[PDB]
Design a protein around this ligand. Sequence first.
Ligand SMILES: COC(=O)COc1cccc(CN)c1
Ligand SMILES: COC(=O)COc1cccc(CN)c1
Length: 330
Amino acid sequence: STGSATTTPIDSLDDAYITPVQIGTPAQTLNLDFDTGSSDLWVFSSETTASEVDGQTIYTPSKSTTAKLLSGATWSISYGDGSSSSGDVYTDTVSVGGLTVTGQAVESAKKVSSSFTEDSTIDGLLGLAFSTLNTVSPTQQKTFFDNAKASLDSPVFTADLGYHAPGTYNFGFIDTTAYTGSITYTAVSTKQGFWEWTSTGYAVGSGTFKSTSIDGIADTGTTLLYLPATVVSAYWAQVSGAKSSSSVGGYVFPCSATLPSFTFGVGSARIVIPGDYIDFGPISTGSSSCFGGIQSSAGIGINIFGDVALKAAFVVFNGATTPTLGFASK
Ligand SMILES: COC(=O)COc1cccc(CN)c1
Ligand SMILES: COC(=O)COc1cccc(CN)c1
C-alpha cells in the first residue's frame, strides 16, 4: 500500500504545516501537525477542557463506531518549546492520504497548554519519530508509520515541505519526479528516539564550505534551524545590523536586509537554503526588526534541522531494519 497527502503552511511564515487525517467511522477529518520529532498521535477532542478549545476541530469518539477506549491508558507529553498536553486513549481507524491503519492509538486530549489553544489551525499532532518515545502508559503505543510499515510497498515516508506553498507527505514510495539529482543517504542513530544524523558541514552564502560534523535531528515539527552558536554567529555576521537579542530570544536582523543563503552538507552532497527561507518577519506587528530562521541550539541540548532546513530538500525517512535518512535538492 501507499498514501499521499498534501501538507499546507498554517500561516504566511510557514510556522508549521497541517495535513488532513481521517479518524473514525464515519471519518472525522482533523488537520494534524506531522512531527518527526515526537511519537504521539494526539487530538483535540470532545473530552478537551472546554475553555482550552478555541476554534480547533475536535475528535468525538462516541460518534465513531470503530472507536474503542484503551482501558487504563493515559498520556502526557511536554515538547521542547515548553508546550504540553495530556489525556486518555482510544484505538480507531486512521487514514492519511488513502493509507489506512486499523487499531491506531488516538490520544484524546483532556488538557492542552495555552500555545495549543491559541493556534486554531492545528487540531493535534501526528508523531513520526520512533515509537520508543511514545508517552502512553502503562502500555506504550506505536506510531502511525510503525503500524503501517509492514503493509507499505517500501518501509519509508517522505517529507516535501513547501516554501510559502503546499507540499507533500508520501508513505510507502519515493516519487522520483519530486526532486532533482540524486538522493544522498546518511546514517541515523535511534538511541534518543529521533531521526538523528550527522551533517558534514556548512557554508554561508557564496563562502567556502566548512567541513565539520554537526549532529542533529530531522524534525518536521520544529519551525526553525537550530545549530551550534559558532555556526549561527558565522551566518548572522554576514547580515549588516543583525544581532542576538536576549529580550526577543534570538537573532534579529533589519527587515531591509537581503539574507544570504545557508548550505548544509549531507555526505558529499549540499543542500542550499535560500536566504528568503530564513526570514520570519517582524518581531511584532509593524516592527522593522525581523526574526531570524537560523538560531542557536546552545540552550536546547541538541541541534535541530527543522522546517527551515527540511523545506529546502526532498527528505526520505527510511524505516528499514537499520533506518537511514535521504536528502535531495528539488
Ligand atoms: C521559535 O518557534 C517559533 O517561532 C514557532 O512559531 C510558531 C509555531 C507554531 C505556530 C505559530 C503561530 N500559530 C507560531
Ligand atoms: C520551537 O520548538 C523547539 O525548539 C523544539 O525543541 C526541541 C528540543 C528537543 C527535542 C525536540 C524534538 N522532540 C525539540
